[PDB]
Amino acid sequence: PEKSKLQEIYQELTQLKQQQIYQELTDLKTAFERLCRHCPKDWTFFQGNCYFMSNSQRNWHDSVTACQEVRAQLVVIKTAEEQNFLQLQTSRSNRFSWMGLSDLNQEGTWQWVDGSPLSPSFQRYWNSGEPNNSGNEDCAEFSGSGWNDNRCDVDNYWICKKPAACFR
Ligand SMILES: CC(=O)N[C@@H]1[C@@H](O[C@@H]2O[C@@H](C)[C@@H](O)[C@@H](O)[C@@H]2O)[C@H](O[C@@H]2O[C@H](CO)[C@H](O)[C@H](O)[C@H]2O)[C@@H](CO)O[C@@H]1O
Ligand SMILES: [Ca+2]
Ligand SMILES: [Ca+2]
Ligand SMILES: [Ca+2]
Ligand SMILES: [Ca+2]
Numbered sequence: 001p002e003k004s005k006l007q008e009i010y011q012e013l014t015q016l017k018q019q020q021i022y023q024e025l026t027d028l029k030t031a032f033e034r035l036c037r038h039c040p041k042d043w044t045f046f047q048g049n050c051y052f053m054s055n056s057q058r059n060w061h062d063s064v065t066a067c068q069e070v071r072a073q074l075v076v077i078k079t080a081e082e083q084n085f086l087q088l089q090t091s092r093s094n095r096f097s098w099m100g101l102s103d104l105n106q107e108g109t110w111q112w113v114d115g116s117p118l119s120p121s122f123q124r125y126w127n128s129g130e131p132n133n134s135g136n137e138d139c140a141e142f143s144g145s146g147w148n149d150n151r152c153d154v155d156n157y158w159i160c161k162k163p164a165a166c167f168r
Contacts, residue, residue, distance in 0.1 A: 006166060036166035041071075049163050051164040053076065053089060053097070060139040063098045064113060068159035074100035075159040076112040083125060085158060090142035096150075098158040101140035103149070107133065110140070118149055 011027060018118065041048035050072075058066060077083045077099065077110045090097045100113035110118035110131075131149035139152045142159075150156070 037164040060152040063158035072160035072162035075161045
């Protein structure tokens with residue numbers, strides 16, 4: 001079967017100035033996954049991943065579960081280019097949307113739903129004066145041209161993300 005041979009490729013990979021060897025290893029792995037670009041209907045393809053801009057609103061927690069139900073994740077932003085792309089989409093659609101970011105576990109400590117912390121290089125995306133935790137806000141949303149922390153129980157459109165697949 002096809003899905004079988006694919007296994008054989010990832011299998012061999014696992015079985016494979018040192019930082020220079022791994023850097024090229026990442027290039028190779030990426031050159032292959034680059035061939036897998038199938039996205040579910042109505043989803044957007046962007047840099048190897050598929051994004052879904054919901055057509056309805058939900059609170060933050062319900063948005064998180066909505067994404068898991070389609071084998072995806074409330075969008076966790078990894079690069080500046082990704083952030084700018086999403087911000088433009090939400091900006092043009094005039095819709096406030098949730099992202100997988102919150103300081104729920106510990107006020108002030110922003111963390112993505114995949115465990116990773118908010119890097120200082122992303123602090124520039126917050127809107128002027130944010131995050132102000134006005135009335136205890138622990139969830140991030142695309143608001144205007146930047147981010148804003150809002151209440152978890154508020155309703156917003158959301159965005160989910162998952163890797164493009166090799167088979168339809
Ligand atoms: C405590 C409170 O509810 N204040 C609201 C304002 O919202 C707060 O301040 C803004 C700047 C933002 O930090 C929100 O997260 C706070 O809840 C509210 O301003 C608007 O707030 C929405 C977000 O819900 C957008 O950010 C708009 O751009 C803001 O103008 C104002 C007017 O709606 O009412 C209270 O002061
Ligand atoms: Ca290379
Ligand atoms: Ca809090
Ligand atoms: Ca908070
Ligand atoms: Ca706020």
